[PDB]
Ligand binder design. Sequence first.
Ligand SMILES: [Mg+2]
Ligand SMILES: [Zn+2]
Ligand SMILES: [Zn+2]
Ligand SMILES: [Zn+2]
Lengths: 105, 129, 49, 247, 205, 396, 76, 75, 754
Amino acid sequence: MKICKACSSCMVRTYVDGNIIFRCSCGESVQGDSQNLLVSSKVYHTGEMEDKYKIFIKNAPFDPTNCQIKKDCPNCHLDYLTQICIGSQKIIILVCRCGYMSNRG
Amino acid sequence: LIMDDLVEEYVETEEENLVEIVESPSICEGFVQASSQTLVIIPDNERITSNVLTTFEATRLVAVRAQQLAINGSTMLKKKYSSPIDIAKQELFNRKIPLLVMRCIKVTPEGQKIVEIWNPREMGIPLLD
Amino acid sequence: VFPPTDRDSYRTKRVHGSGVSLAKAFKAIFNTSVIAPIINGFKELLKQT
Amino acid sequence: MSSRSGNKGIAALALPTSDMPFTEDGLQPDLIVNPHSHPSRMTNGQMIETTVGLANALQGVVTDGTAFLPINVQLLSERLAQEGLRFNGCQKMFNGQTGEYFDAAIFIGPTYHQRLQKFVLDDRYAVASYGPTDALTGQPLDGKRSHGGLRLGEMEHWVLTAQGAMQTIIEKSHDDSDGCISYICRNCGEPAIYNASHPIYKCMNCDVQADIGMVDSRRSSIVFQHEMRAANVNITSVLSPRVFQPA
Amino acid sequence: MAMQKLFTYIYEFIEYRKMVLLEEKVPYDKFVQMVLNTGFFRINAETLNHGIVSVFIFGANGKYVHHGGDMRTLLTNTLNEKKHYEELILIVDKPVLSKKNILDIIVEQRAANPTIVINIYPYHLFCINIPKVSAIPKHKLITQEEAQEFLGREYLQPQDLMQISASDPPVVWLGGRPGDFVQIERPSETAMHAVVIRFITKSKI
Amino acid sequence: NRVSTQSLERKNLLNTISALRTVNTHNTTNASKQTERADMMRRVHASYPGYICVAQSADTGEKVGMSKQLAITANVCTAGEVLSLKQRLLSDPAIQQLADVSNKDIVRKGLARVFINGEWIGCCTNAFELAQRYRMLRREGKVVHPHTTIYWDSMVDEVEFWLDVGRLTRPLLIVDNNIEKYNQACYKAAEARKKGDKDWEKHKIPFIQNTRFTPQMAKDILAGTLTLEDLVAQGICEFITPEEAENCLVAFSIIELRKHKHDVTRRFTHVDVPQAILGLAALVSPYANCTQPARVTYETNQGRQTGGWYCFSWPYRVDMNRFFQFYNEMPLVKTIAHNYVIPNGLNTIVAYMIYGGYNQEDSVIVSQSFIDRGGFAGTFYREEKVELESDIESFG
Amino acid sequence: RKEGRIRKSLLGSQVWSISRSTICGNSDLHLDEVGYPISFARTLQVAETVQHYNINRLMPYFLNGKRQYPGCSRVY
Amino acid sequence: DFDGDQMNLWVPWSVMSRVEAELLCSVRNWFISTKSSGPVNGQVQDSTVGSFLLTRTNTPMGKNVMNKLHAMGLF
Amino acid sequence: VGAGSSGGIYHLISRRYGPQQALKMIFATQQLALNYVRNAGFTVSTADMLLTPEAHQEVQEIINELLLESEEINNRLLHGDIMPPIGLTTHDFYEKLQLNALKFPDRILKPIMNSINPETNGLFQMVATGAKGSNPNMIHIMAGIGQIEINTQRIQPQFSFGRTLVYYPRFALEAQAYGFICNSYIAGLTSPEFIFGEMNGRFDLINKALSTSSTGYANRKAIFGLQSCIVDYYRRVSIDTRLVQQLYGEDGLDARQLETVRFETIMLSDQELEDKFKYTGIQSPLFEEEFSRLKKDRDKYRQIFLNVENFNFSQLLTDVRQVPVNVASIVKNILLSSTSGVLPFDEKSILQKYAMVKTFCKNLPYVFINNIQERLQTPIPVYLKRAASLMRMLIRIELATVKTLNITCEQMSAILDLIRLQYTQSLINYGEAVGILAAQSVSEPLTQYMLDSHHRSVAGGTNKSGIVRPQEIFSAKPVEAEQSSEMLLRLKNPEVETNKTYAQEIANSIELITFERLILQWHLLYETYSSTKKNVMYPDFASDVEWMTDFLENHPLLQPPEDIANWCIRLELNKTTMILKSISLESIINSLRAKHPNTYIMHSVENTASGIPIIIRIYLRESAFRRMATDEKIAVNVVDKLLNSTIRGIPGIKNANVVKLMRHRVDAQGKLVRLDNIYAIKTNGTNIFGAMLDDNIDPYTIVSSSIGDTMELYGIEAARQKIISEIRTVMGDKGPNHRHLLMYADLMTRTGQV
Ligand SMILES: [Mg+2]
Ligand SMILES: [Zn+2]
Ligand SMILES: [Zn+2]
Ligand SMILES: [Zn+2]
């Protein structure tokens, strides 16, 4: 995302000819070096189990409706933990109100 | 003024993909009248249809005979009956029904109707019972 | 990241009875059968006088 | 009639009190429910209600049988036994018609039954050969309320056609419906004017060369063809050609 | 790969048609190399009538399947050779059929030469011994007089029968022209095999 | 026209009451096309229990699942005092208004968006604690109305307050526990384990969860001294909306609560009464949990068609196709539904037997004597109303 | 449409001399027999022509009329 | 079934229809299903179990026998 | 005596004494049974469905065993022990495992039968005798409801994210949370069990209402398409005058006049056929010819119905056929009423009885024409000589000389005259609207298809829910519109076809593997390549020159072209998938360069240590961006055409499973044995043409579920046979007669196209 320093407008990319030169509707150009060459990308089985459920995992020990199991918490030694199942991979996560997160999630 | 009870609307969405000078005469074209056909009766030795009456044909014979006995009164039954249905049925079973079964198999473009005339008194009779 | 709204879940559904439905029907009907009569009457009155 | 477990039933028998089956104590039913109504419908609530009602009638009590309240069929059966009846609600029953006891003990007891408001006297309808007719199609009016009608729809016609019926189709669809008789010129294919009482024999298409034929039809069909003609699409009936055996 | 199956089953087809090969059968390597460089392979066979049949196997990405001018040139140069030319067979890939320009070429060349027959077929029609497939019942062409006597007994016109396209694989392997009759011995789960006669219509494409 | 109408068919008072407790979705223009949609909107949804009768539905044709029925305890709320709650939220020190925080502050500080009636006003650092505190305030009931819906969406960390009209709510008995004391005991046992004490199990207290409802208040309710208003005021129970229902873990019965009384893995926020999941007409069926559920639906349909005392003012009315059954009986095995609607029918002695084969295919053999004595007999009424077209017509 | 001229009036019809009622079981009837209430039997009629062979049989029907069953009320 | 079903009944009056009705459309022709080629009718419910009880060997009382008067009553 | 019981006593009474006597004997037996219960008495009681306390203690023990296995599955999930099969996600496999865990075992009948006195139990007798109900009804009432399945899967978490109901916690692992009902009806369901039961109860009510309307549209469409089919005086089926069928059922018989009989000679071996059917009482050539004609009939029956087995999925060969006349019964009746006993040996009679049976079979097709042409011995059409082939078989089997020894010549003529009478009475009638009969007989089983649709899966690739499959056949949807396309490939050679390990590997080889599943990340970069002289690259991927220089010298044959465009896609490979499905880096690069000649290829070395990504960089040439849209729109399109490039397998084949077949084969001794050790590949998706290319798969026995692909690849006749098979699979076991399926197929395929 390139924004015009004067117009604060989105600039087209305009790959001409051997380089990348951004152009605004105001006629300004800023060009681009090295790190602007990424045209498009796609990563498979990524963006899942980190960004989709971060808030849900954080709030899970405080959710009354989450299922809980009898398992000792390593940190605060509470006799019960909150059991969490996410994804078509069925990843089981145990979280506690003390912040213990089972290093998974 | 709330009217309500609208007549709706109707939509058709499909297509029917139905796969020398000339002027207007009145006799070359037209002729809604169909040419009179001539009846060709297939000879009794060339008939290839069943010699046994179908239940449809036997039922039609009995029904026609019973109606004609409802309008007329003449029959060939020695044993008299009180119902035209019974008289027609026994006439069919006793092989004395005054009706013929014409089975039509052709309509020749030359205006020729080829038929097989079958005698119910010589034909086999289906169950009907 | 999130699934679509459940079209049948009752958390996102309300039940409107008598008061609300009659309120909406009445506002439409009052508009049509009160304001427009008055509107046309005043237009004709300005025409006449 | 229906039970509170949802078992509808049309009553077809009226037995006098002497023809009703009865138990050794003289108890006889008001309704006789087929035991086959249970196994495929799984309406166990009706049977449990019958058991509890059998126990209740003798104690003179009315129990609360609300859903999800704790229930023990074994203990209700033991209550039946303590009430003087059998563990099951069955009794020694005698056939009312012949006085012979049944070999098996018959499960008879009170069941709450509801009369559904679907009366046969309202639903039953019979019509004669004549009555009100629709002005447009010439067919009978629709339904009991109009004092004539009842319909032989598409599916009835398909079934009769599958049976190869005709005649019955002729009778019902023409004689007992809007059966009319239509006249076609056979020369122009257009409907023609024919009358025997008033000696008129004419068609407006080719008048002097008219050859009016008599075609069986329905008033609905003629109305349909008139509607098509009014839509400026012309309908010409070719008519079957005459056949002549050779001289 | 598909071309090897063509290289075997096209001579299976030629043998079935009761035709004799008019050339020495080249090996597979020369076949594939020639189809790669020239773009086509011409196979000549002769029927008992002593007519000539030519079979053309175009490459998947050749010239004659992209530009119609070369296709016209090939057809024109072939048809004024000194041959009887009972039929010409063109084998192309399946999407080549959906390209309208070559279809226009073949239609106009069919119009140009009416006495001979030119047909274009996809690859799959010659990548298996088609008559030997279990799912395909037995097809065979019946002569005109026996079909006519069958019709006369049945009081039928040829157009009253069930119709079959001349592009049907079994019919193509039979070499049935439109307007001819093919008799089929279909296996039956009601009567333990039955016989019907179908009418060959104009070949699709 | 968004007015869900229905002619008042007075088959019985049960029919009338069920009609006035009926929820219709009432397909509008651009209705259900051929898809999964026509099926899903007719299925029993997982949010139905307690508010929509799971059993009651039409058993035939297009109307199957189209018309829904309120459960026995479900109620429809009116619009609350939105202004007072909004002012209290704005005066709350824990909520930072829109004018005070920007979007960059919202994402960088992890603020949780707070809504009231969908109006996003304010943000909070701890959505859970805010929602719990206001739930406690509502339980107290003096500053937050008991019918306000406090919903905490833990997936997006948003606290939604709802006070608009049309919220189905049902009262649920609140279940309290000792999780604070349990956690304190667990921490003390952990300290004992760390110090190496041999008898650390004496420091672990058992978990106890229980509703506050006692049989004395059951007697008080039956005696009439205690009402649901007092129960809500005393904090025993509270109203729960389908939005808030997703923040509740409910024990389906007092039996399930008692079984898990010391199970720290099942901490129920509320305890249900199982009769609440059924409507009024569905509760007419006795032992409905033993019956197959589809037959219970069939009963819901047939209970509202049953002949009976269709209206106590029948002699003053001129109605059409109305049947008044002379004799009625309370069921020997009655249900809770009959406390509110009069019963329709009779306690018929029925014999489940083979008698002459006249009862095959759900037919019934009826004692003619039972018919003659008045069994299911009554009066059927029809009207004949005609009017004069003008002065040109008269009666005579 | 279903209520149109073709599907309602041509492909189907309203007919006369037809009755409708609820069905019920009768174990004493043969499989090829139907129980017809006498009220419906006196409403629906069967057209029997008068001939020499049936005039004796149709006389009891004619004499009964509407008064007694079996009877008749129509003569062409 | 008899749960409230209504079925139409019309009596043919025309001689052609009456002849047709008994000869062609009688239910005896629909005993064998056209769809399945098997029989349509048979014993249902009260008689399927009744045929088993009549023809079983041993009743709980003993051997499944009846005296002459009750054997006659079956007919 | 039950209704609809083929081969029952009423069906047999109809065959011998007409359907009217069958109706009378139904009523007479009905009164006999009903009058018996008028003294025996029958009832059902609440105690009939009540278990004993000991048995109820055993029902719980059985259910706890089920819930123990479910928890054992859950304990595997907690420790990550659930490894799903290739093609299924863990959640899909976990749900599949659970549905197998909560299945009621056959032993659940033990507590029920311990609490049941079968001599007096009314509920059991109704179920056991077939009067009403079935075993699930008894188990549900008494033992337990078990798992609640909606569309062959458990209750879905619809209440919230991960919640099935407000009564269960989020991500609850107990089977009860997902519909497993533990109580029985007589015990009384709890509040959440009733809610789950109501979800299944309503879902059945919805299916019924859909069934009436969904079949109504299909029934009317089917009627109008078929109604104009009418049997003409040749007993053909023609629309107006255009032929649709050379003969109505290919045998010209009414469906109401068909009887199922067994052909004894089908399964007999060469020796056993000789033992039973060869006659040795007279040393004549009339009997060695007879046996050969009897063996010839057996060989033709086997060859035809093994062929039918070959182009169908699971259509087993059977020795039972529907024939107009049951010749065995006619012989049995004559032999019973014969006054003579074991007839004395009379050579003239035995030879003459053979003569009249041989003559009767020769003149048998004349029952289709008439007795007049039979007398004149006019030629028989070829199709009429085939219509009697099956009936000739039964007559030559039942009336074999070894079987009619005790039948006198006079009785033989009576037997033959009886067969002709019963054959003539079974022929279809002229003018019968048989097209409407087919429409009515196929539409009705479609109604049960909707009710059964709740027992069929909904997920893609197997979208057999509701009316989806019936519309595909009837609306002639093309290959691309098929949502449940399948093929059945037979492994070439029969001996290697018996090995499961060889079967599973060939299935993987023919499956379609494309680029996208071999890649875990790709990037489109705006950079060119002019060897190691100019550089200029993306910063993160600038390190790639460490291997691109290795590639430059290791692969000097294909140097960077002179027309490299200023674009590049860098792709990483999922080595585990490469390890899983055995695609090497060599095969990927070779297939790409052969398929893509406007691109230029760089790749790393795959033998690197674990964790080191394998890098593929493609470089576009000027031909890509020269041969309307901007360059980046072309470059983005290059990404897709590279990502969808076929690396290995037959196109269009999504999955390829290994299935065990049942096929009949003839031994060396001539016996017809049914094998179960045959393995074949059943694939999701259809490509007949590709499978023919594959040399490890037999091309002649390929079977597809697609009518469109069968039509294009095989012809109108295999498409016609495919339509019959496809409807028959839809119809079920209770489905209609076979002649009603022929009527559909012959109508659709009468013009040469479906
Ligand atoms: Mg019914
Ligand atoms: Zn700018
Ligand atoms: Zn912790
Ligand atoms: Zn005229």
